[PDB]
C-alpha cells in the first residue's frame, strides 16, 4: 500500500503533502 | 522534478524531511 504507492507513483511534493505522517 | 519514485530509505528520507520528521520512517507497504 501507501509505501509501494510512493515507490511507484512517482512520489513527489503532493505525495509528501498527502503523506505527512 | 527528480521523479524516480521513492521506496524504503529514500521514501522515508524524502518525506521525513519535507513533512515526515513529524510521524515517519516506518512505512509498512
From Swiss-Prot, chain B:
Outcome, altering residue 10 to D: In HPRI; Providence
Protein name, UniProt field: Insulin B chain
First and last residues shown, out of full length: 25 to 54 of 110
Native source organism of the sequence: Homo sapiens (Human)
Amino acid at each position: 500500500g501507501i509505501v509501494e504507492q510512493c515507490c511507484t507513483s512517482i512520489c513527489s511534493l503532493y505525495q509528501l503533502e498527502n503523506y505527512c505522517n | 522534478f527528480v521523479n524516480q519514485h521513492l521506496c524504503g530509505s529514500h521514501l522515508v528520507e524524502a518525506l521525513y524531511l519535507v513533512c515526515g520528521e513529524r510521524g515517519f520512517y516506518t512505512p509498512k507497504t
